[PDB]
């Protein structure tokens with residue numbers, strides 16, 4: 001009817017006392033036993049005439065706090081998982097017989113938490129429908145088991161696993177999988193584990209490689225007849241970054257003289273009614289090759 | 300792991316002893332408790348320094364046989380149903396703690412058995428399809444429950460009922476029903492009750508009243524022209540027995556001189572070619588009236 005909880009390593013005080021000592025009634029012995037289901041083992045004994053007795057596996061771990069005809073309260077020190085059980089405290093008395101009480105000792109263990117990414121190089125790819133492992137969250141050897149979950153704006157799938165260890169602790173593992181995408185890059189993925197009203201949180205930032213997404217800037221609403229010295233710039237979003245930039249027009253040739261320094265496209269001084277046209281930058285990176293465009297107006 | 304059985308009123312010995320008394324290990328106190336599946340009430344205590352104590356109950360019903368540091372054996376006397384339960388015998392010791400053993404005490408009760416027939420007078424009737432109670436077999440307040448059955452060549456139905464009393468005993472009742480018939484009369488129907496390998500048996504003989512069933516004997520394959528002094532005799536099977544026997548022919552009149560002394564139909568001396576005919580006996584009893592017949596032949600050669 002009464003429960004005690006304590007963490008591995010800590011000390012708990014197990015109370016036991018005799019309700020209504022009466023002059024006639026003589027307490028012979030006080031005995032703590034522990035029940036592991038169906039089975040009693042002896043723990044500690046206090047006998048007024050004979051003293052105290054602690055049994056292995058309690059050798060240096062139990063003492064009576066105030067041994068007495070009516071108080072058998074003990075302290076159990078340096079809790080270990082093996083201490084879980086039901087503790088019976090029993091007063092042997094004359095002439096009235098035995099009188100006992102019970103209490104449940106539950107031993108708890110705080111888990112060990114961490115997150116870790118794949119060794120694999122996350123790589124987005126057209127036609128790949130395949131979900132890939134990207135992070136693993138572990139809450140190890142906790143008791144009771146912790147609860148694992150994810151906090152991310154990513155839209156991947158999580159699988160969860162519990163391993164009940166023989167000692168009674170439980171390791172909780174979650175594997176986070178997704179289909180790698182441009183948008184997933186540099187996104188944060190946070191594993192979470194609430195244990196005993198603590199909330200632990202540990203983050204990753206995903207590194208996803210992707211084919212270049214090309215844009216061309218430097219264009220202005222108005223471009224004169226004979227405006228000066230105007231540039232175009234090819235901003236290509238890629239990971240890893242793009243290593244080559246090649247220019248062309250929609251009509252084949254780059255109108256001499258429009259000079260290309262890579263990923264910059266300079267027009268010298270005079271502009272005219274020629275230089276009308278689609279312009280294209282072709283970016284390349286380890287993943288990819290792709291292009292962008294500009295319609296250029298001059299009046 | 301260890302079970303004791305005793306009957307109500309008798310005594311059992313609940314053995315308890317401490318295996319390996321050691322100089323090291325001091326027995327402080329010896330205690331019997333009677334666990335009632337959840338609770339725990341003290342029974343008797345033996346303390347070497349202080350003596351013996353029987354809590355009450357069972358003030359005059361328990362004693363340690365040979366109270367001792369290492370023998371806690373008690374006798375529980377004049378057993379009662381309330382004594383059922385699990386008995387824990389526990390040795391309190393220093394420095395080694397408690398040492399206990401358990402045994403199950405099952406208290407048994409011998410049932411009371413009997414049979415009793417209906418007080419109604421059983422009466423057969425044509426067209427009555429209805430099964431009627433004819434005997435009740437009771438095995439009362441037994442524990443464990445006995446097993447009731449019937450031993451009869453009668454063809455009736457038995458219903459069985461079990462009543463669990465609050466004290467834990469069990470009454471078994473069996474009701475034996477049949478449709479009363481001529482054939483059921485004087486048939487024996489005893490009830491059987493098996494308990495603790497005893498076989499109890501108690502019998503009834505049915506008394507079924509019925510309308511007469513008439514037979515006519517004394518007719519012989521051959522009856523001469525002019526054979527002597529031949530009788531017809533009307534045996535009427537009835538219960539209670541028939542009190543009246545009335546004769547007639549199928550053609551009305553009795554050929555004089557054929558004399559009727561009741562339930563005998565005497566033909567004096569000479570027989571002839573007359574005296575041919577169907578003859579009928581009409582029996583009557585409190586239940587009934589019914590008749591029988593004979594077709595009578597008379598010719599020359601036998």
Ligand SMILES: *[C@@H]1O[C@H](CO)[C@@H](O[C@@H]2O[C@H](CO)[C@@H](O)[C@H](O)[C@H]2NC(C)=O)[C@H](O)[C@H]1NC(C)=O
Nearest residue numbers: 008081109110140141142165166167168169171
């Ligand atoms: C419960 O048992 C587990 C399983 O053995 C213990 O966890 C192991 O601890 C040691 C180091 O402390 C490692 O060598 C193992 O690899 C650990 N983990 C696993 C999954 O095997 C754990 O210590 C026990 N829990 C306690 C004592 O709280």
Ligand SMILES: *[C@@H]1O[C@H](CO)[C@@H](O[C@@H]2O[C@H](CO)[C@@H](O)[C@H](O)[C@H]2NC(C)=O)[C@H](O)[C@H]1NC(C)=O
Nearest residue numbers: 307380408439440441464465466467468469470
């Ligand atoms: C168990 O309960 C029954 C039911 O009352 C007891 O049987 C009765 O005994 C008394 C005499 O002591 C009779 O007058 C009753 O008529 C009995 N039978 C019934 C069916 O009522 C029986 O004694 C109890 N068994 C015990 C105490 O062992």
